[PDB]
């Protein structure tokens, strides 16, 4: 009840910007990490939000993860005066960056390559659907299922289809170097719309080129990502179920099974897993969630995900504090249903599993001294059922581990492993405990007090 | 479809045109009538409509009748008073700092002063966290049952409200027997008192119901998922059919599509392995009754089930039933049961077979009863003896592979297996 | 205790021939099957022994298996006056059917192909060992490790080497047609020195050519058989650990592991398994066995073998009756150690396994109605822990099943399965019972009384 | 070599030439001296020879001393009489139809008449199936122990005969403590009375011994394998080291090669997972002592072990030990233990690790004690503290992979793992 195993991530936006210095404290006290969406964030909004986060972290001695979420590529209506669409109207799309008023301009051939007859085109976030009735060289006709106004610059998605667009997106490249002066304060970079390992690697090389030392979080947002889940999971540092986005490509009744499959796959492969968006959605307008939202959060957390990410609920909603407060409160009630076990792929895995089961058998807390976070993460993936205290001499490692299952990262300067572990045991050595360190090729050490 | 679907009839189902009523009943396995709200003649008309559909479509449906139970029947900040509230047991239960709840827990009154035949508090009647000590069955449950007793042969389940002990349940059973009912007793778990007494209460029930609305009044909003889970796990452990009722597709009272959170809630609740889910207000009085059962049924078709709590093996008929389920599962086979009482069918269902179980029976009332038990598909099959009945069931539903069975306590059990 | 699960096989010889009509009854009352060794058996000895067996079977209504054991090929010293060998003497072997006195004649090139320098040659049942010191075209020199007399016609074995000799042996072919007039009374034919599936198939085709309807029992006698165990087991009807013979090719300390491996392999593949020879060996001279022999029989039976075969103990020994009496008595004491489970290779296997575990769970006896013995055998291989009553309308099937684990075969004439099963239930239907029949492609029926 | 080898010293080992004695002691992990047969000076000379070898070869050996115990000390068909047989308890125990056994059960006498101070019967002294009621320790056990008490620091195990209750065992323990012994008490299970009381007796023993010779007198020849199995299974269940003694290579008294049946018996007995096997007559008085231990040791090198009865987990030190064994097994690693008392080493051994466990200790007496426990290879390692001792053990036997450990009750347990 008292300390959460499921980690709590909130998105920062205008609703958090205006928080009284004292409201802000009570808000950050209830999170383990923060997200900044580089779609809606100005470089000096990013800079100022991160500064407020790091300032809080210093004052309260609480390592917090900073996540930046990249926009990713998009296909948008080109230049046009607003086009008014009537229900039943046959609407024409042409490959063009500018129309003469008689059609909808779409400046990307990948839209035309993705669309077939009977596909459904989604505009206005999914509020305008158009049924495709004919296709040609660089054009499409579609029947509007309702009335609506199409504006230049609005995004276009094809229900259940992925766009074949070269990556990383030019706008992502631009956003990453704009923010590169503060790269040492960024713990996770979240990739949108990746569907192959090649896509992920490209962002990795770019982040390296630009001097970032960040974990790469891969959002599963589309049918194409779901069909390539095995390989995508294995090339990620962190996996994210992006519910809002995935809801565009699946029926609303089909989404629970897809969420389950993403979560099962990530746990199997020992990748940390998040569920994002549409958790406490009603709370944009209400200081209390609905009963169904409480059950939703409760059962999502029970599956054994590492973290839950609030988006609009905190970014733009009316009750950012109530939202994180209700998140944390629900989590304190969670009983976890025996999670998918990860695959054992080496000796170190067998060691960590044996440790976790031992601590479970003795009713013991696990303590880890970890230089880079490696053993701490290996322990976490086996889902220990109590808090795992992790001592580290690197503040950047402490921040990274803040959003990993059960981990409580503590900044502890130390000359070597043995000195580090003894400082951690001094500090957190209530009985029973199982305390370890160990690196590949070295002696692994365990101190057990029963 | 393994999880069974129950809808409540009310004003909104009454007004349905003939073709719309067919589409509605096609999407449920049983129906609930709330005796609190229905008049005797609404009860009669709704049962007649159900049995008439059942005869036309050749599909047995359970009729559940829901009893009111022994319940006790404004400005922000006001000091409000209460008086002989015709029931004494209210003033016996209430204390200082207790919360009194009104209009379904919408307005809360923190008791400032306790008196004698009175109380005062700072803004059906409930005391949060407390059970009233009212002797059972209530007078008006006796009245309601006596009044529908001429239609008793068409009542499959009688659902009891506010039980907290086996005595509550046994008393209703005696009353039903006296009035000539042959109904199963469904016990709603609605209070802290029921939850604290869960073990004994589950074991003396014929069917257990998580009544989420009523129970939500005694628990925090964030505490109720754990309680639902304990209730479901306990019923499954003791081999009792289990339903979750109310607050499933609540937003559908005003919209023909549920929220995503409601879809997830329905999905995860079904995934636990409950026998049935009961819609209440969403169909009884809501604007979109057909959309509601259409959506329940659709969500259920996507469900993948999570390995349920296994029941205790209490005897060798249990070991027999469990072995048949594991056998059928290992052969990829359907189970067929011929039964006069439904007893072997229910024993097999409690081990949660993952395919439809076809149950042949010559007793139409048994077939109606089984329609809201997990996985069971009951078919009316007249037969002179068990062997003949099983031969006819196989003849009718014997797509291979199958495991087909009958047997009663102390008799030779027969199994036919086609691989 | 009262009825054995492990079946008891005795070899008939001169010691049983002379049994008083009344001693014979008490002897056969204690066996489930009889072996006749066609090495030492004259066709009219075979005929008369079988007649006495079938006569007893009729009188006592007890189906008994008759096993005939084939001689198999051998390499024997050719024609020569006795050769006296001194310890340390360098002895010469030449390819020849007749010597001039100066060497040992061996009329089979396969001997010369099998022998290398440092091999050990075994004569006089293993009592004369010779160490090979040089080899040539069609000759060998070897140093005698002790004194001895080599006689023409004596057998020669190379320790740990197999002979490449074409099969079936001409003498086996001769013995099988000599006995072919009484072929309908022969239930098992035991093959010596097979080391490939081809060898087994050749005996199968010969037995078919000659009108036999017998199960083929394959003796594992050599290192070459042990190295080809997987395939040899899978082509057998019945497997036999021939301890005496295998003891020539392995150290005496190495034999327990080889026995275990043969038994484990046979159980895995659902082949009935016997252990033969050297069970109650001291009993040739004593009416009581040694303590070590009691432990040996006890532990061999515990492994879950279908049968134990006495050889010399009954064939030529002084106490044939005490020997079978002590065998049966020891078995009544056996507690069985959870045997190797057979592989599930079809639906019928899953059915039979499920039945056996069910009967185990209900504390029930299994009853089977079986036309050819097929389901009865499939049940037996899963090692039910109580007697399995088997009704059959074929007396030849009843005899076959007599030496299969736990089976009690009963001759029951019946028109069909359903009538057969109801006669069996009438006869053996003490509660609890699990009674079945079923053939491939048909309805399998189970009657369960709890 | 995981199963430990014990030989009895006697006339045949005494006469061994220096080089032959070295070859003999090289093939055992402990030695037994039978105080029934040895004089005090044979005891002294044989212990001195053992400790002298141990010092020269740097290998600790357990010295087991076997106590006589409270035992009571012709033509075919004759009527034989018995008289105040100096012990009364004989005539208290014997009845009509009982069998009296003489000269190791070779001749049997069926009691025809019971008298008072006498008996008559139709053809050490034993009554088949019966235990005498003689108070313990016996006078001559007190005598034998007092007489070897100056060499007590060189006695690792004292083996008790004919115990049937915890009181028998506790009494010997008090006597040993009084005389200043620090020996383990080995309890021989030798009678029906011990077997009927097996549960309590096993739990108060330091080491359990199946004495097949003595026990064979009270059971049928065909009944003894089941009894041995129950004894072994029970000791393993309660985490007690277990030996099988006598009648292992009996024919080797007169032949330098065992029978096949004896090889099988040794093999299957070792395969059950016993700590040790004890040769008695085969080495003490037989013609071929060296061949006997040479053959025991050879058979043991072929043994494949059958998954043994697992011990009860009674506390969290047990859960710790078992987890280390399973860990080492999963890593393909050797276990190293540094220990002052041998307690953690014995706790690890009872979970039956399938590799050698190297145990470092600065207490030579502990090292001698551990040499007849399953899998343990004790090394004398002087160390100032536990950390230093484990560092030295690792330095010496740290072939990777290894799981290396120390820890005492209520202290921080330390494990070092190299993968």
mmCIF file of N, CA and C in Angstrom, chain B residues 200-276:
data_model
loop_
_atom_site.group_PDB
_atom_site.id
_atom_site.type_symbol
_atom_site.label_atom_id
_atom_site.label_comp_id
_atom_site.label_asym_id
_atom_site.label_seq_id
_atom_site.Cartn_x
_atom_site.Cartn_y
_atom_site.Cartn_z
ATOM 1 N N UNK B 200 -19.198 -18.618 4.552
ATOM 2 C CA UNK B 200 -20.429 -19.359 4.910
ATOM 3 C C UNK B 200 -21.568 -19.045 3.944
ATOM 4 N N UNK B 201 -21.719 -17.766 3.603
ATOM 5 C CA UNK B 201 -22.785 -17.304 2.712
ATOM 6 C C UNK B 201 -22.689 -17.873 1.285
ATOM 7 N N UNK B 202 -21.484 -17.890 0.731
ATOM 8 C CA UNK B 202 -21.260 -18.453 -0.597
ATOM 9 C C UNK B 202 -21.639 -19.934 -0.590
ATOM 10 N N UNK B 203 -21.246 -20.645 0.465
ATOM 11 C CA UNK B 203 -21.496 -22.093 0.548
ATOM 12 C C UNK B 203 -22.962 -22.515 0.675
ATOM 13 N N UNK B 204 -23.836 -21.611 1.124
ATOM 14 C CA UNK B 204 -25.258 -21.932 1.212
ATOM 15 C C UNK B 204 -26.115 -21.303 0.097
ATOM 16 N N UNK B 205 -25.472 -20.639 -0.863
ATOM 17 C CA UNK B 205 -26.167 -20.041 -2.005
ATOM 18 C C UNK B 205 -26.323 -21.021 -3.144
ATOM 19 N N UNK B 206 -27.347 -20.844 -3.976
ATOM 20 C CA UNK B 206 -27.370 -21.545 -5.262
ATOM 21 C C UNK B 206 -26.631 -20.766 -6.372
ATOM 22 N N UNK B 207 -26.551 -19.438 -6.250
ATOM 23 C CA UNK B 207 -25.962 -18.572 -7.288
ATOM 24 C C UNK B 207 -25.524 -17.331 -6.505
ATOM 25 N N UNK B 208 -24.337 -16.794 -6.788
ATOM 26 C CA UNK B 208 -23.818 -15.610 -6.087
ATOM 27 C C UNK B 208 -23.811 -14.421 -7.050
ATOM 28 N N UNK B 209 -24.196 -13.242 -6.562
ATOM 29 C CA UNK B 209 -24.243 -12.022 -7.382
ATOM 30 C C UNK B 209 -23.435 -10.919 -6.711
ATOM 31 N N UNK B 210 -22.433 -10.401 -7.421
ATOM 32 C CA UNK B 210 -21.786 -9.169 -6.993
ATOM 33 C C UNK B 210 -22.700 -8.000 -7.395
ATOM 34 N N UNK B 211 -23.341 -7.349 -6.425
ATOM 35 C CA UNK B 211 -24.196 -6.209 -6.736
ATOM 36 C C UNK B 211 -23.356 -4.946 -6.537
ATOM 37 N N UNK B 212 -22.723 -4.503 -7.623
ATOM 38 C CA UNK B 212 -21.710 -3.450 -7.557
ATOM 39 C C UNK B 212 -22.280 -2.119 -7.064
ATOM 40 N N UNK B 213 -23.490 -1.765 -7.504
ATOM 41 C CA UNK B 213 -24.131 -0.514 -7.080
ATOM 42 C C UNK B 213 -24.284 -0.434 -5.571
ATOM 43 N N UNK B 214 -25.044 -1.381 -5.015
ATOM 44 C CA UNK B 214 -25.309 -1.451 -3.580
ATOM 45 C C UNK B 214 -24.038 -1.578 -2.747
ATOM 46 N N UNK B 215 -23.112 -2.418 -3.200
ATOM 47 C CA UNK B 215 -21.852 -2.656 -2.489
ATOM 48 C C UNK B 215 -20.931 -1.441 -2.502
ATOM 49 N N UNK B 216 -21.021 -0.643 -3.565
ATOM 50 C CA UNK B 216 -20.200 0.560 -3.708
ATOM 51 C C UNK B 216 -20.467 1.597 -2.628
ATOM 52 N N UNK B 217 -21.665 1.535 -2.057
ATOM 53 C CA UNK B 217 -22.087 2.398 -0.958
ATOM 54 C C UNK B 217 -21.332 2.158 0.348
ATOM 55 N N UNK B 218 -20.863 0.928 0.558
ATOM 56 C CA UNK B 218 -20.187 0.561 1.804
ATOM 57 C C UNK B 218 -18.661 0.578 1.710
ATOM 58 N N UNK B 219 -18.159 0.747 0.489
ATOM 59 C CA UNK B 219 -16.723 0.764 0.225
ATOM 60 C C UNK B 219 -16.318 2.033 -0.507
ATOM 61 N N UNK B 220 -15.038 2.369 -0.457
ATOM 62 C CA UNK B 220 -14.529 3.459 -1.292
ATOM 63 C C UNK B 220 -14.599 3.021 -2.750
ATOM 64 N N UNK B 221 -14.613 3.992 -3.655
ATOM 65 C CA UNK B 221 -14.653 3.706 -5.090
ATOM 66 C C UNK B 221 -13.424 2.876 -5.523
ATOM 67 N N UNK B 222 -12.260 3.225 -4.967
ATOM 68 C CA UNK B 222 -10.982 2.542 -5.231
ATOM 69 C C UNK B 222 -10.812 1.174 -4.543
ATOM 70 N N UNK B 223 -11.697 0.862 -3.595
ATOM 71 C CA UNK B 223 -11.628 -0.386 -2.830
ATOM 72 C C UNK B 223 -12.477 -1.524 -3.413
ATOM 73 N N UNK B 224 -13.414 -1.174 -4.286
ATOM 74 C CA UNK B 224 -14.400 -2.124 -4.790
ATOM 75 C C UNK B 224 -13.856 -3.216 -5.747
ATOM 76 N N UNK B 225 -12.864 -2.891 -6.616
ATOM 77 C CA UNK B 225 -12.251 -3.941 -7.445
ATOM 78 C C UNK B 225 -11.651 -5.141 -6.698
ATOM 79 N N UNK B 226 -10.998 -4.901 -5.557
ATOM 80 C CA UNK B 226 -10.472 -5.962 -4.691
ATOM 81 C C UNK B 226 -11.606 -6.835 -4.133
ATOM 82 N N UNK B 227 -12.716 -6.201 -3.756
ATOM 83 C CA UNK B 227 -13.868 -6.877 -3.149
ATOM 84 C C UNK B 227 -14.569 -7.772 -4.182
ATOM 85 N N UNK B 228 -14.793 -7.229 -5.381
ATOM 86 C CA UNK B 228 -15.348 -8.001 -6.487
ATOM 87 C C UNK B 228 -14.491 -9.238 -6.737
ATOM 88 N N UNK B 229 -13.181 -9.041 -6.729
ATOM 89 C CA UNK B 229 -12.254 -10.139 -6.983
ATOM 90 C C UNK B 229 -12.318 -11.239 -5.921
ATOM 91 N N UNK B 230 -12.391 -10.845 -4.651
ATOM 92 C CA UNK B 230 -12.514 -11.793 -3.552
ATOM 93 C C UNK B 230 -13.821 -12.586 -3.654
ATOM 94 N N UNK B 231 -14.904 -11.901 -4.011
ATOM 95 C CA UNK B 231 -16.221 -12.532 -4.163
ATOM 96 C C UNK B 231 -16.234 -13.557 -5.288
ATOM 97 N N UNK B 232 -15.669 -13.178 -6.437
ATOM 98 C CA UNK B 232 -15.599 -14.059 -7.600
ATOM 99 C C UNK B 232 -14.683 -15.245 -7.302
ATOM 100 N N UNK B 233 -13.478 -14.983 -6.787
ATOM 101 C CA UNK B 233 -12.552 -16.054 -6.445
ATOM 102 C C UNK B 233 -13.181 -17.056 -5.459
ATOM 103 N N UNK B 234 -13.828 -16.561 -4.406
ATOM 104 C CA UNK B 234 -14.537 -17.435 -3.450
ATOM 105 C C UNK B 234 -15.653 -18.295 -4.022
ATOM 106 N N UNK B 235 -16.526 -17.720 -4.841
ATOM 107 C CA UNK B 235 -17.573 -18.525 -5.500
ATOM 108 C C UNK B 235 -17.008 -19.595 -6.409
ATOM 109 N N UNK B 236 -15.987 -19.238 -7.198
ATOM 110 C CA UNK B 236 -15.318 -20.211 -8.097
ATOM 111 C C UNK B 236 -14.667 -21.340 -7.299
ATOM 112 N N UNK B 237 -14.045 -20.991 -6.170
ATOM 113 C CA UNK B 237 -13.396 -21.953 -5.267
ATOM 114 C C UNK B 237 -14.407 -22.988 -4.748
ATOM 115 N N UNK B 238 -15.602 -22.518 -4.380
ATOM 116 C CA UNK B 238 -16.669 -23.381 -3.862
ATOM 117 C C UNK B 238 -17.671 -23.881 -4.893
ATOM 118 N N UNK B 239 -17.387 -23.634 -6.172
ATOM 119 C CA UNK B 239 -18.170 -24.248 -7.237
ATOM 120 C C UNK B 239 -19.583 -23.725 -7.334
ATOM 121 N N UNK B 240 -19.727 -22.423 -7.078
ATOM 122 C CA UNK B 240 -21.010 -21.727 -7.148
ATOM 123 C C UNK B 240 -21.050 -20.804 -8.374
ATOM 124 N N UNK B 241 -22.106 -20.920 -9.195
ATOM 125 C CA UNK B 241 -22.244 -19.960 -10.296
ATOM 126 C C UNK B 241 -22.204 -18.518 -9.771
ATOM 127 N N UNK B 242 -21.603 -17.617 -10.546
ATOM 128 C CA UNK B 242 -21.310 -16.259 -10.081
ATOM 129 C C UNK B 242 -21.592 -15.220 -11.198
ATOM 130 N N UNK B 243 -22.358 -14.202 -10.837
ATOM 131 C CA UNK B 243 -22.724 -13.098 -11.705
ATOM 132 C C UNK B 243 -22.160 -11.792 -11.168
ATOM 133 N N UNK B 244 -21.858 -10.860 -12.062
ATOM 134 C CA UNK B 244 -21.555 -9.498 -11.642
ATOM 135 C C UNK B 244 -22.705 -8.641 -12.202
ATOM 136 N N UNK B 245 -23.347 -7.860 -11.329
ATOM 137 C CA UNK B 245 -24.512 -7.067 -11.708
ATOM 138 C C UNK B 245 -24.312 -5.574 -11.475
ATOM 139 N N UNK B 246 -24.979 -4.776 -12.317
ATOM 140 C CA UNK B 246 -25.088 -3.298 -12.251
ATOM 141 C C UNK B 246 -23.802 -2.546 -12.609
ATOM 142 N N UNK B 247 -23.957 -1.312 -13.090
ATOM 143 C CA UNK B 247 -22.811 -0.457 -13.409
ATOM 144 C C UNK B 247 -21.834 -1.131 -14.378
ATOM 145 N N UNK B 248 -22.352 -1.756 -15.424
ATOM 146 C CA UNK B 248 -21.476 -2.381 -16.417
ATOM 147 C C UNK B 248 -21.366 -1.520 -17.679
ATOM 148 N N UNK B 249 -22.510 -1.112 -18.215
ATOM 149 C CA UNK B 249 -22.557 -0.175 -19.356
ATOM 150 C C UNK B 249 -23.430 1.047 -19.018
ATOM 151 N N UNK B 250 -23.195 1.612 -17.831
ATOM 152 C CA UNK B 250 -23.949 2.757 -17.301
ATOM 153 C C UNK B 250 -24.159 3.961 -18.232
ATOM 154 N N UNK B 251 -23.100 4.425 -18.908
ATOM 155 C CA UNK B 251 -23.214 5.517 -19.879
ATOM 156 C C UNK B 251 -24.224 5.228 -21.015
ATOM 157 N N UNK B 252 -24.527 3.949 -21.263
ATOM 158 C CA UNK B 252 -25.457 3.574 -22.341
ATOM 159 C C UNK B 252 -26.926 3.874 -22.061
ATOM 160 N N UNK B 253 -27.218 4.318 -20.840
ATOM 161 C CA UNK B 253 -28.525 4.890 -20.545
ATOM 162 C C UNK B 253 -28.868 6.098 -21.438
ATOM 163 N N UNK B 254 -27.843 6.797 -21.942
ATOM 164 C CA UNK B 254 -27.989 8.070 -22.676
ATOM 165 C C UNK B 254 -27.222 8.100 -23.993
ATOM 166 N N UNK B 255 -26.449 7.048 -24.256
ATOM 167 C CA UNK B 255 -25.663 6.941 -25.478
ATOM 168 C C UNK B 255 -25.762 5.525 -26.064
ATOM 169 N N UNK B 256 -25.788 5.404 -27.409
ATOM 170 C CA UNK B 256 -25.904 4.054 -27.987
ATOM 171 C C UNK B 256 -24.544 3.353 -28.149
ATOM 172 N N UNK B 257 -23.501 3.942 -27.575
ATOM 173 C CA UNK B 257 -22.153 3.377 -27.598
ATOM 174 C C UNK B 257 -21.581 3.556 -26.200
ATOM 175 N N UNK B 258 -20.915 2.516 -25.639
ATOM 176 C CA UNK B 258 -20.242 2.651 -24.334
ATOM 177 C C UNK B 258 -18.933 3.443 -24.407
ATOM 178 N N UNK B 259 -18.406 3.832 -23.242
ATOM 179 C CA UNK B 259 -17.056 4.391 -23.139
ATOM 180 C C UNK B 259 -16.039 3.253 -23.273
ATOM 181 N N UNK B 260 -14.821 3.600 -23.681
ATOM 182 C CA UNK B 260 -13.672 2.679 -23.671
ATOM 183 C C UNK B 260 -13.411 2.048 -22.304
ATOM 184 N N UNK B 261 -13.485 2.840 -21.242
ATOM 185 C CA UNK B 261 -13.288 2.307 -19.895
ATOM 186 C C UNK B 261 -14.341 1.239 -19.552
ATOM 187 N N UNK B 262 -15.576 1.432 -20.012
ATOM 188 C CA UNK B 262 -16.685 0.490 -19.770
ATOM 189 C C UNK B 262 -16.517 -0.817 -20.527
ATOM 190 N N UNK B 263 -16.000 -0.710 -21.754
ATOM 191 C CA UNK B 263 -15.604 -1.855 -22.565
ATOM 192 C C UNK B 263 -14.502 -2.655 -21.857
ATOM 193 N N UNK B 264 -13.482 -1.970 -21.353
ATOM 194 C CA UNK B 264 -12.382 -2.620 -20.621
ATOM 195 C C UNK B 264 -12.873 -3.322 -19.354
ATOM 196 N N UNK B 265 -13.709 -2.632 -18.592
ATOM 197 C CA UNK B 265 -14.350 -3.162 -17.371
ATOM 198 C C UNK B 265 -15.172 -4.413 -17.680
ATOM 199 N N UNK B 266 -15.999 -4.366 -18.725
ATOM 200 C CA UNK B 266 -16.781 -5.547 -19.100
ATOM 201 C C UNK B 266 -15.849 -6.682 -19.489
ATOM 202 N N UNK B 267 -14.809 -6.357 -20.271
ATOM 203 C CA UNK B 267 -13.888 -7.338 -20.796
ATOM 204 C C UNK B 267 -13.110 -8.056 -19.686
ATOM 205 N N UNK B 268 -12.565 -7.286 -18.735
ATOM 206 C CA UNK B 268 -11.732 -7.832 -17.655
ATOM 207 C C UNK B 268 -12.592 -8.602 -16.645
ATOM 208 N N UNK B 269 -13.821 -8.143 -16.444
ATOM 209 C CA UNK B 269 -14.745 -8.843 -15.557
ATOM 210 C C UNK B 269 -15.136 -10.192 -16.158
ATOM 211 N N UNK B 270 -15.514 -10.223 -17.441
ATOM 212 C CA UNK B 270 -15.780 -11.502 -18.119
ATOM 213 C C UNK B 270 -14.555 -12.432 -18.103
ATOM 214 N N UNK B 271 -13.384 -11.865 -18.379
ATOM 215 C CA UNK B 271 -12.134 -12.611 -18.430
ATOM 216 C C UNK B 271 -11.816 -13.396 -17.137
ATOM 217 N N UNK B 272 -12.255 -12.892 -15.975
ATOM 218 C CA UNK B 272 -12.136 -13.605 -14.672
ATOM 219 C C UNK B 272 -12.855 -14.975 -14.606
ATOM 220 N N UNK B 273 -13.841 -15.183 -15.473
ATOM 221 C CA UNK B 273 -14.518 -16.478 -15.568
ATOM 222 C C UNK B 273 -15.892 -16.530 -14.910
ATOM 223 N N UNK B 274 -16.551 -15.379 -14.753
ATOM 224 C CA UNK B 274 -17.886 -15.350 -14.139
ATOM 225 C C UNK B 274 -18.878 -16.076 -15.044
ATOM 226 N N UNK B 275 -19.925 -16.669 -14.474
ATOM 227 C CA UNK B 275 -20.990 -17.284 -15.276
ATOM 228 C C UNK B 275 -21.747 -16.298 -16.158
ATOM 229 N N UNK B 276 -22.084 -15.138 -15.604
ATOM 230 C CA UNK B 276 -23.007 -14.229 -16.252
ATOM 231 C C UNK B 276 -22.770 -12.785 -15.872
#
